[PDB]
Amino acid sequence: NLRVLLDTAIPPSFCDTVSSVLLDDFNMVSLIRTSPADSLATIKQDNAEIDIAITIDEELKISRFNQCVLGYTKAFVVAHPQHPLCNASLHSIASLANYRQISLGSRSGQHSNLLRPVSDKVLFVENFDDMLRLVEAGVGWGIAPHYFVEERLRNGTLAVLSELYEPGGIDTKVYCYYNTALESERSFLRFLESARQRLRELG
Amino acid sequence: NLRVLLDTAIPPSFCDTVSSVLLDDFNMVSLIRTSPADSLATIKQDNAEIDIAITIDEELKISRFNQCVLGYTKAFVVAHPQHPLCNASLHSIASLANYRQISLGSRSGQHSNLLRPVSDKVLFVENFDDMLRLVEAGVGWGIAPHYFVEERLRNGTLAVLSELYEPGGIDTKVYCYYNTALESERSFLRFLESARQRLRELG
Ligand SMILES: CC(C)n1c(NC[C@H](O)COc2ccc(CC#N)cc2)nc2ccc(Cl)cc21
Numbered sequence: 314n315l316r317v318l319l320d321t322a323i324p325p326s327f328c329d330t331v332s333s334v335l336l337d338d339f340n341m342v343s344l345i346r347t348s349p350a351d352s353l354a355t356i357k358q359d360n361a362e363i364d365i366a367i368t369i370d371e372e373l374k375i376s377r378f379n380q381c382v383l384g385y386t387k388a389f390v391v392a393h394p395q396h397p398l399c400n401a402s403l404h405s406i407a408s409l410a411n412y413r414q415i416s417l418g419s420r421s422g423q424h425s426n427l428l429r430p431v432s433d434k435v436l437f438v439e440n441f442d443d444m445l446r447l448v449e450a451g452v453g454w455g456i457a458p459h460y461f462v463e464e465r466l467r468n469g470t471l472a473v474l475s476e477l478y479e480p481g482g483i484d485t486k487v488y489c490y491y492n493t494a495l496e497s498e499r500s501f502l503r504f505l506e507s508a509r510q511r512l513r514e515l516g
Numbered sequence: 517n518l519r520v521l522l523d524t525a526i527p528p529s530f531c532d533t534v535s536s537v538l539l540d541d542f543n544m545v546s547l548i549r550t551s552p553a554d555s556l557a558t559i560k561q562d563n564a565e566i567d568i569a570i571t572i573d574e575e576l577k578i579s580r581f582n583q584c585v586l587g588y589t590k591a592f593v594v595a596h597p598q599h600p601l602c603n604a605s606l607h608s609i610a611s612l613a614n615y616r617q618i619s620l621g622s623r624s625g626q627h628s629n630l631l632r633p634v635s636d637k638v639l640f641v642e643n644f645d646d647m648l649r650l651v652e653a654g655v656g657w658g659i660a661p662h663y664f665v666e667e668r669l670r671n672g673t674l675a676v677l678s679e680l681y682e683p684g685g686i687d688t689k690v691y692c693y694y695n696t697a698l699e700s701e702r703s704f705l706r707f708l709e710s711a712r713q714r715l716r717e718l719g
């Protein structure tokens with residue numbers, strides 16, 4: 314009845330904040346997970362009949378969807394503590410373009426400017442687990458959401474490279490792509506107001 | 517000796533923070549202002565011999581320049597308090613694409629995805645003063661930096677539309693594009709460390 318896409322980069326804390334708020338107003342609610350790389354490809358399918366996508370991916374205008382900002386999350390670029398680039402010097406960070414990147418693939422094969430790989434040496438996976446497996450074994454480096462990485466960092470098994478590029482981790486906006494229909498529906502503006510307010514309570 | 521570009525979107529508070537820090541290490545320092553729309557076009561000119569650009573504009577890789585994040589600033593979309601879109605409803609914000617936008621022009625005529633206009637009805641100017649003139653007279657709407665707008669907002673002469681798109685104003689990263697040469701130069705890493713640290717003191 315109300316279909317909702319949540320990409321894999323959205324912390325599960327955000328996913329309970331949304332579900333909780335939506336259930337106040339809506340009777341039937343469906344929650345679908347996607348790779349960030351497949352999130353916008355999915356809502357562009359009319360048959361998929363998504364009503365709301367919460368995703369990190371951005372495009373300037375999709376046909377029947379408006380865009381707004383729900384909040385902010387932090388990606389880090391990570392590699393094996395004894396990776397070529399372990400020192401994390403600006404030179405190291407410049408060289409990311411030359412060392413093998415572990416990137417999320419996409420059904421369509423295409424990628425947004427925001428999400429495509431920065432490296433020529435690229436090896437695709439389907440999710441951030443497949444990614445962080447290949448990375449603890451040093452096959453490459455990858456960008457992954459904070460919540461996927463916090464453990465393996467204090468567990469010494471992974472190291473951050475991003476800090477000299479963007480201290481505190483790479484800020485990424487969480488977009489809300491909503492069917493135009495839902496503008497001027499108190500139920501949705503209520504979802505938006507609450508979801509946001511409760512993620513300023515998180516942040 | 518050290519040429520530094522600062523685009524017009526960089527608050528003048530950031531511009532004193534940078535200059536102060538740079539003077540500790542460097543003897544001869546030149547500060548050049550540019551439209552955000554002309555900032556990257558300028559450093560791509562080899563003859564221009566820029567060593568550092570501080571700008572809101574982003575491209576994935578310029579030839580002899582690396583990129584990093586200095587901090588964050590806030591744009592707002594603004595119009596005449598009695599503009600068609602005064603209510604600032606999601607429908608209003610969706611309609612930005614149809615009402616006349618006052619945008620900054622560029623020498624090259626071309627624009628980055630990040631900075632190009634969202635509207636078909638578009639009227640170019642050269643700076644945010646020319647912009648906010650045309651906007652208080654309701655010829656259109658425009659996105660302008662916080663520091664350009666704070667006065668005319670509490671002076672009732674301008675109204676915000678952005679809030680339902682991005683509460684608190686549209687977060688935009690401030691990029692630092694530095695000549696590859698300056699990586700592994702304590703003087704630059706000192707500038708970076710201090711400039712950043714003193715803009716977390718601002719923020
Ligand atoms: C939104 C973005 C941050 N992102 C990506 N991938 C986009 C791109 O391939 C990332 O490449 C970069 C590599 C290095 C640097 C600078 C440094 N250090 C910048 C970009 N994958 C993501 C997964 C999760 C999240 Cl939250 C954001 C991701």
Ligand SMILES: CC(C)n1c(NC[C@H](O)COc2ccc(CC#N)cc2)nc2ccc(Cl)cc21
Nearest residue numbers: 525591630631632633634659660661678681688
């Ligand atoms: C970096 C960006 C925010 N920006 C721009 N122009 C880019 C683009 O033309 C802005 O259009 C938008 C219009 C509406 C919305 C959603 C709402 N409400 C989003 C984008 N010009 C800028 C001037 C100063 C600064 Cl700091 C950022 C600017």
